Structure 1
Amino acid sequence: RAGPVTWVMMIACVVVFIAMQILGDQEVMLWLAWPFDPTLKFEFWRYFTHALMHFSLMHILFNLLWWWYLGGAVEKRLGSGKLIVITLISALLSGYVQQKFSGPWFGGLSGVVYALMGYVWLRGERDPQSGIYLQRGLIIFALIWIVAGWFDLFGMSMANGAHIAGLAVGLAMAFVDSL
């Protein structure tokens, strides 16, 4: 079954998604979004918690499916702490880039997912002895996912700075780790 980190991320995203349905999207964003006013700059959770918010059923479903699979794999083969760090780094960096180009009103675990895609792949392709890799078939679907993000094929208004920054981060960490 899914490790503790894989699990708590999924439950946290579900809990937050429920709150967004009950209270509305904007209201939850007041609390969890990247700082949108200078008065909010020291509320350090916001640099990360944007990743917990999803704006539709499909948004959350596909993110959690990928997270469940890729995150679960990282945790099992490389440990909980490693998944934690990939998650914090990709969340922080993807938010930063997204914000830079589009402002603070955004959310979604997809920055982390793309990081996990790049990470699991490059790490298997450069350090097979790590005991983790992205199976041939899933490489294909990962690529399609990336293509869909890049060309805005999801039918989402959300921009896609988060997407490329996430992938770049995952690749970079795999590089460093395979050394």
Structure 2
Amino acid sequence: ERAGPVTWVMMIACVVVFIAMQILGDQEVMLWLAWPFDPTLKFEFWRYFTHALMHFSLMHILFNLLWWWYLGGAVEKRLGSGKLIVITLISALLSGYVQQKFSGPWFGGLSGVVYALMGYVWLRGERDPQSGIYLQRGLIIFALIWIVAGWFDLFGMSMANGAHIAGLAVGLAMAFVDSL
């Protein structure tokens, strides 16, 4: 029993980066991995994605990776690595875009991506049971509680509601496309 290669490599990468952040401090790692925060950086193309790899607390990374492991892992197993890769790239790009637009380039984390995955697995199951992909009732509840936590700032997070929504929109859009 094991998480697929994308699911696994993403978790490893997040952990390595989290470690780098402990050794060097958050700021220094952000200096290299954050969304372009200066026009002289706009052509360092890894930055449009690598912001998703940074986490700022234990909770952040523990919870993001837990949801990534479960939702990302299920999508990878049942729908393929390619599917997970595309959901990840698109949600990371759009949620990052929306985030920097409203609040500037200093942010990070897999939240945009897990919102997408959450939206994807849920809607897919709603519209296409026979797909084998669905979000259990109990998990819908826990997902909702964390959405509330982020919406009303019960727990301080890196990204704002807008970027979380942008992540969700991506997942819903792809599930919708997929269930035609």
Q: TM-score range, shorter-chain basis? A: over 0.9
| Aligned-residue RMSD, C-alpha | 1.0
How many Å apart are 1:178 and its aligned residue?
0.8
Q: Distance in 2 between matches of 1:160 and 1:24?
A: 26
Shift in CA distance, 158/167, structure 1 to aligned 2, threshold 3 Å = closer
Q: Distance in 2 between matches of 1:115 and 1:30?
A: 26
Q: Distance in 2 between matches of 1:173 and 1:149?
A: 23
Q: Is the 8 A contact 2:99 2:159 kept in 1?
A: no
Q: Distance in 1 between matches of 2:101 and 2:3?
A: 34
How many Å apart are 1:59 and its aligned residue?
0.6
Q: Distance in 1 between matches of 2:66 and 2:54?
A: 15
Aligned to 2:128: 127
Q: Distance in 1 between matches of 2:79 and 2:157?
A: 33
Any unmatched runs of 5+ in structure 1?
Answer: none
Q: Is the 8 A contact 2:150 2:156 kept in 1?
A: no
How many Å apart are 1:156 and its aligned residue?
3.3
Per-residue Cα deviation, 1:22-43 (whole angstroms, up to 9, x for no partner) = 0010000010000001111111
Deviates more, 1:85-94 or 1:147-156: 147-156
How many aligned positions are there? 179
1:12-161 equivalence runs, <5 A:
12-156=13-157, 158-161=159-162
Per-residue Cα deviation, 1:122-162 (whole angstroms, up to 9, x for no partner) = 01111222211101110111111111111111133643322
Deviates more, 1:166-175 or 1:13-22: 166-175
Deviates more, 1:169-178 or 1:11-20: 169-178
Any unmatched runs of 5+ in structure 2?
Answer: none
Q: Distance in 2 between matches of 1:148 and 1:134?
A: 19
Q: Distance in 2 between matches of 1:169 and 1:23?
A: 33
Q: Is the 8 A contact 2:109 2:158 kept in 1?
A: no
Q: Is the 8 A contact 2:36 2:48 kept in 1?
A: yes
Q: Distance in 2 between matches of 1:156 and 1:4?
A: 28
Identity between Structure 1 and Structure 2 (%): 100
Per-residue Cα deviation, 1:11-58 (whole angstroms, up to 9, x for no partner) = 000000000000010000010000001111111111111000000011
Q: Is the 8 A contact 2:111 2:159 kept in 1?
A: no
Q: Distance in 1 between matches of 2:21 and 2:116?
A: 25
TM-score (norm 1): 0.97
Q: Distance in 1 between matches of 2:167 and 2:14?
A: 18
Shift in CA distance, 96/82, structure 1 to aligned 2, threshold 3 Å = same
Per-residue Cα deviation, 1:88-147 (whole angstroms, up to 9, x for no partner) = 000000000001100000001011001110000001111222211101110111111111
Deviates more, 1:123-132 or 1:14-23: 123-132
Q: Is the 8 A contact 2:52 2:108 kept in 1?
A: yes
How many Å apart are 1:79 and its aligned residue?
0.4
How many Å apart are 1:77 and its aligned residue?
0.5
